[PDB]
Amino acid sequence: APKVIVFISGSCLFGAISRSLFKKLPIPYTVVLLILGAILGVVASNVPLVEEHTRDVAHMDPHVLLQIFLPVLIFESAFAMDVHTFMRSFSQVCILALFGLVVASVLTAVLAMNLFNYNWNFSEAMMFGAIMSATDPVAVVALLKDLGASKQLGTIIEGESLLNDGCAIVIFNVFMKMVFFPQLTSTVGQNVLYFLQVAVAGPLWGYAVAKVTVFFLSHIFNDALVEITITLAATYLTYYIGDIWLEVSGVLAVVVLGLIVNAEKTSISPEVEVFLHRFWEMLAYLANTLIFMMVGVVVTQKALVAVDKMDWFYLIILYLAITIIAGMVISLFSPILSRIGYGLTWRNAVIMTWGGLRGAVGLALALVVENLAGNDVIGSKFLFHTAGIVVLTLVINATTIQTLLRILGMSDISIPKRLAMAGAVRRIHEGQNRTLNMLKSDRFLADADWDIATAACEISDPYPSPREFADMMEEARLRMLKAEKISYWKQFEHGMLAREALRLLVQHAEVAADEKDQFILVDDLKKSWQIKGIYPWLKRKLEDLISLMYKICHHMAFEVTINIAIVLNIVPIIMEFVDALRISNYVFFVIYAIEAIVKILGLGRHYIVSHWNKFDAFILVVALVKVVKLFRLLRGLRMLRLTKALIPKLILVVNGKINNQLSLGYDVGKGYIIGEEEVGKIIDRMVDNKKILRELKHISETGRLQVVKELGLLQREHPGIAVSVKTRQAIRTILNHSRETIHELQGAGLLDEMEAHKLELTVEIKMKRLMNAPSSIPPPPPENLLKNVSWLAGDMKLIDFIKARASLLHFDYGEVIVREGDESDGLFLIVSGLVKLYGKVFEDYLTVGNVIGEMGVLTKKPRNATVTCETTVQVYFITAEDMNIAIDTFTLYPSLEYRLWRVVAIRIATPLIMEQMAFQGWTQEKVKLHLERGYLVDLAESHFQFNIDATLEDVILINGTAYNAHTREEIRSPCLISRTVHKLTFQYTATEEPRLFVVRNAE
Amino acid sequence: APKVIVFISGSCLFGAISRSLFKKLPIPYTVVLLILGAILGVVASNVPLVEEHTRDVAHMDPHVLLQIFLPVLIFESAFAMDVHTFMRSFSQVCILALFGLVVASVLTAVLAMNLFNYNWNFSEAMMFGAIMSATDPVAVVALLKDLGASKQLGTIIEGESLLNDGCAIVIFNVFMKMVFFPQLTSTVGQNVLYFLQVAVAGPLWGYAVAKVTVFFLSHIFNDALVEITITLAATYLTYYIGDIWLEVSGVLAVVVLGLIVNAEKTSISPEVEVFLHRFWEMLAYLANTLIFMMVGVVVTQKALVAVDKMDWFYLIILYLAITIIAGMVISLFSPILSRIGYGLTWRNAVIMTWGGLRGAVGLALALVVENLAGNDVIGSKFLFHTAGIVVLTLVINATTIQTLLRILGMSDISIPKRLAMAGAVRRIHEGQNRTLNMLKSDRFLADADWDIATAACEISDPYPSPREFADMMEEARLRMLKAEKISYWKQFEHGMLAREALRLLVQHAEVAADEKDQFILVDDLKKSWQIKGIYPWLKRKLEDLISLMYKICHHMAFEVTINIAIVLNIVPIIMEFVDALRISNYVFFVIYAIEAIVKILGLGRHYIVSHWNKFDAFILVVALVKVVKLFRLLRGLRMLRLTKALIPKLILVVNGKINNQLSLGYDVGKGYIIGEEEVGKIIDRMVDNKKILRELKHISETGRLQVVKELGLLQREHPGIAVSVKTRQAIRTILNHSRETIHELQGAGLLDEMEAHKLELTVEIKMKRLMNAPSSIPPPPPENLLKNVSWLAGDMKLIDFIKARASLLHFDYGEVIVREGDESDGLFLIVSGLVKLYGKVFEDYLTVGNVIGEMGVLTKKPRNATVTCETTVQVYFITAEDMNIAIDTFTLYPSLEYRLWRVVAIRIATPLIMEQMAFQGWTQEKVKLHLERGYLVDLAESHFQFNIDATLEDVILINGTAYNAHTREEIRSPCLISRTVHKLTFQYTATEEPRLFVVRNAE
């Protein structure tokens, strides 16, 4: 009976000890595992009891390593990494990784032939080179994450190393079959078929299983166990079907699964994500520690009795050569691949060519070779050289990478840490001092040991002239970039931005920051919503043209019955090409009679269908009838009916792809617009030069106008996808705000924990259902647009009155609707097309669902902005006389005048509160939500005098000329009343009736 | 080769299907698993291919069920439940569960003897009863959690059922050995020793392994993988060592390990807790579904071919009998055990005697019996009756428990849902409507489909006269209880309360709520800090009196060298009772010479120690020397030096127990005091009767005074533990507030996600290090108390000046220190003892570290409260003339006068802002932290006139008479200035100087 408990338990304990005790040291903890295994190996070589307890795990079957350890170690790497940045340039990175591994393997094999004195063939040398061409970027990515070189460079090298490991395993298997099992006699055509089976069919199987898994996972709500078990069983079944068919070369399939399931994380609950990540991390950790222990013991016991001085000399030469060729491949390949957008600097190339640590994949392959070799010296040489190279890398490179980085670019933390991390630690210290001073004046903690608290609560920092004009210009540019980054992050924390859009925006900000003089250029951002114009649009266009029983027999299972008949009939169809013939013939005749009477009924359909009717008639003609062997399969061509119902599914999937691109484009554009709008208000009081601030305002306005025009045209091009994405945005905003309300209720004590958990559960169910919505919502008719206006919704009589007196107007390109200075003819409502509103110095673009001329119909003022049609525009026109009639008709508390004045009041009051800036962090959304709570009260009830309390947070003058009760303080609209005022009255003037907007505090 | 992949995969798939499809249905999903297994069993009995694919998992070895399935199913139940309420009355619940299972098993066995026609012995019948005496409370606890009957009743029944399952397994094994393996022979002594091995040694082994595991887990910081692997390996090794020694009776050891590890959750990171809980949940889920599938197929294939009508009749009679005896045991046992503090009602007893569902433990035992029986009909009868009883319970009881509850107590949701859940949903709806109205007036989402958003964003509700005087009295009492519960929850969310203290307080509130007329009585709360007065205090007292080389050779390894020598010498000592004798004798002689020269050196220690020197001399006398066999072990009695170093460890563990009790007591007392203090201010403006509010204020004041006096005496009794717990409270408060500051920085965009993660990591490391602090911090000397005063700290010259002129006064019980009306002699500082400050109608208790008479030395006003010594009090006295000299000496910006005025200003201004309550949700802590930011500015610099801005949040008049610039507004101190005021000036009056406190808004 084999003894394994002590070895596994001791490996776990020693891994914990080495992991905890080598946290601070720069050396990796795995070399400690290697030396511990070496000591255990020499002890077992001396002591027989330790040998008995060690021999059953130290010398295992090679299929344990090939079938259990390597799939886990590769799947954890594939599953752990983020893919949304790596899968943008997936094909090119795949090509780069494959080419690099192939060339490095060939140079290592040539070195193994000419330099080494062992009589080694090309197959043995190529397996040798494939072993020593598998790297590990863990140190490089760890030291590049915190240094802030790029978040788009660690993912690239991570994915490249993952593909490197996969192809290294594949070629190792290909050459191991030739070396150790030479009885096989596959030909050139068989080799080509095997290459097609490995490099194409495997990833396709993994992709299909992954797609089915996400499809079934998206329909499970509030069940963590079902999702976890389904995901794990799908992983095992993918591995098993790949393993029994492609042997160890069928790892690529599971790799693909690990990527695809990682990409579609929205169908997986976050608790399921964290559980699966920790699960696979623990499995890979156990495999890693076991591999290092067993290679240590088996390299001390066996491979250290057949070594000479020439072996050590060859190990040193090979260590030099692998570094030389690792530099050579990146020198000859990476500068050509400048299309990545992450062009190599002098520091980055040397960092990623020096931190090429070796890992446990090559050690496992060397273990497999040593097990398969037997008593031959080839396994001993393989294990000795692989272990020596791993040791040399893990010492020298892993300890000297930081020193090399300091030599290259001083390893300096730069500004992000120089200043930011200083602010936080200074204000954290001040808050802690304030809390401690509050605690010292308590009544119950007055006897606490304050030395202990003070010492154990503080934290530590982890880390005129043209020249003057250029200096303030650079300072203002850096300040604007910093403020834009703050705005993007604040938009993220409120749930108004997705993670990918925020990452794109901050990547553009960081790219523009380190340049000498470059702001956020629209051309870099334009590659977020322009990606629709590829083959998906053409494919959707091509499929658009292709597409008593049609209504009475119509149901959710009308054609599904025929589809079920096809699915039931494929099984007797498919057995002919792969006794029981009589029953199959009888059911064939029954189904043929059924479809014959179906076609007889369809003869009354007036032959409307052109393709499907002809194909069904041909099918019936074939079914009604050595040519017998041919006719046995000729009747089996009855799959012409599946492609009739498959066209909508392909249309749906191309709609999903277009929507997935358009959502990211819209998020990027909206975030940029909001960031510029906030930064223009922020930088107004932080610049001490009129020319500099004028230039900054000009460039910001130009960029914002270009972005908004492009977004409007993108909406115009395809309405269904735009309506779908905007609806999803609105629903996400509402759900996020309701979740915030739930959390605020829970914090105030008014909600128990279980009640809050139930409400949060309902909110998450609604979010998961929203994330699987239709990807193309049809645009609404203009009547729905007229009925859904903010000041018209809810009143059926008013809706009928306005709809009866409204007219439709159509305008072409270049027409002018209304010029400046003219009297207000009426009120517009854009229902189709973009339009440009320009006047006095300002210019904006209005799109569908927008209203023009509310101020003109309210205050009877002349127009002040010319409106020109950018496209063919359809508008709704309401005459001003009808608007006056409707105003004088409705006299309820939700008055037409009241709502009409409230809308323009909020619209004119938001910029004043934004420009005020008596605080910080007052975003446009939270300013708008603060102004929404406020209301205006007519002065007729209060005898034209208002008494000011301090319960108001802000008071704004939206109309007329103010007159306070002290010295008749006179102010002009629109203006934010000065903080130091008193109670104000008003005089009834028939020419102008002033009105004001007052906002209370939060209850 | 066996085929198992299809069966396991289909079991997982069918479990997912049944679990998802039967969420809404009231029936449990496991009966669907049973019918699916039955259909598969009849198909395999017909079709041979399905039989080949089913027979290898359907008919497994019984040791797979005994060694893998039952340990997992019991450990998951033990590990999942919370224990801090169940382990309060652990021994009594254990006794109750054991007695109930024993009697019910007896009753069942008698029924299986007399009624059934099978010739069954006592052992077979007792194994039958042990199989059918194992229940499952899952439905009862699920329907009692949401109903809100009691949070202290679900845990009790959960633990009782867990112990029931464990003892059922134990007795099943005991009788299965007698039934199926009768070759063994048992005596009285052998059976007694086996009982001692099972019922004592196993739980002790589990407890010891658990203690070692928590000890090693508490020293690991920032390593999830190490903690997870150590915990899982500890679980396996506990199971293995218990297994190979006790067979299936190691479940007690693994249950003890699960409970003890779950109790000590503070040494385990929360991510580790959630991972381990999900891991064991998934394992138990797989075991459950597999067991139900194979019992279905086996009962269909085998047990359904040997049944008669009499078998069904006996099944019905047994189903009635098990319910009858389940009622009988709870009728005869539970009313006696009413000492737990959770008495049984009429509804609860019937609910917990009707919802006795059967589970997979009994099914697994029946499968084991069926496997062991062979071709005998006993296994068929066992499986048939067990499966029938499980089916009948899972249908009838699991579907009719809700109907029975609605018959008993209407299953009505009561008030907590009637009102609370209505407020939240109404408010949530209003917030959603506000957000939607904000979104409709946007510029980019103006074309969204608002019908879809409106329909998919709304949520649904889950659910004079004495009589008049009594009505308002009841309304006021319910309002006070609700406000107290809100205050306790708000204290929890701020981190000022622990979970156990909050649970105790809300349990007392709910207990007092449903009574006719009963407030929060101090006697119920007194059982939180009175639990010190048990044997731990006496044990600590008894151990207190027991306890050139002592300093020069002293180090961290001085006596540890001798301890290491003892640890090295036990191995040659212990082998005598269990060739190599010469080396052992030589090292014995070497160690004896070493300790002889140690005693020679110790001869110069003047023979100071009495016990240890005598024992060491006796050890040396023994070591310097068929009696040879006795002397071979006589020299082995050298374990008298470990108990010298073991006394401090036992003192430390009893200190830890005392501290663990005292922390809960202090938290309960502090939370009650704060809740009463807030509720007294809240209810002031919510009561419309002077008599009712006077009575409520009187009872609240009496309770608060009693609690604060008891807490002061508890501090007085033992200073070290009190200082330790108060220091831990202060450090926890500071760390929580710093974490809040980090989150607020992250929300405002000024901190990146990675920087915030690093700062949070440092905060969690500090919290984990704080949770493992010493449990007895020595009290400070009075000099440290004088140097740590809030208005004296930081100034070394002032500290020296005050310390030079301070005197120490000692007073006994009953003395009066200063009476009312007398002139202020000076300033006090309590450094030892409790003291009572009573005067004018008010009365309070002051403890160490408190200052009396600051107002008297500031404003030179006569004393207004007599101060009487409740105990022997040591105080620090500073003369008033020296205080005046110090005031007139220091003239820097931190003035003594300014600091004293700020302290008394915050002290006098906190109640005014507390009473104002302009915005609800104002806690005392937040009011204090808001007042801390404010400062007072002297009127001499501003020419005795102050200009009011609206940048102030609150203005308070702490001294003098105010005189505004309008009508010379006159107000008297202390008073909160009316919100409607203007800029005020002041006149220089030599007799009294008005001073005021102004607080700005948040930047």
Swiss-Prot record, chains A, B:
pH dependence, entry free text: Optimum pH is 6.5.
Provenance organism: Strongylocentrotus purpuratus (Purple sea urchin)
Region (Interacts with the S4 segment of voltage sensor domain), start-end ranges: 469-514, 689-748
Region: S4 segment of voltage sensor domain, residue numbers: 626-686
Residue positions binding 3',5'-cyclic GMP: G853, E854, M855, R863, N864
Catalytic activity: Na(+)(in) + H(+)(out) = Na(+)(out) + H(+)(in)
The name this protein goes by in its record: Sperm-specific sodium:proton exchanger
Stretch list, region Interacts with the transport core domain: 499-514
Cytoplasmic side: 24-28, 80-89, 148-150, 220-223, 264-270, 340-345, 409-555, 602-609, 652-1003
Annotated stretches, region: Transport core domain: 90-177, 310-408
TM regions (residue ranges): 4-23, 29-46, 63-79, 90-115, 122-147, 151-176, 188-219, 224-246, 250-263, 271-304, 310-339, 346-373, 378-408, 556-578, 579-601, 610-625, 626-651
Part of the whole protein covered: 74 to 1193 of 1325
Note in the entry: The VSD and CNBD domains are not functional in mammalian SLC9 orthologs. In addition, the conserved Asn-Asp/Asp-Asp motif that coordinates sodium ions in NHEs is lacking in mammalian SLC9C1 and SLC9C2, suggesting alternative transport mechanisms and/or substrates.
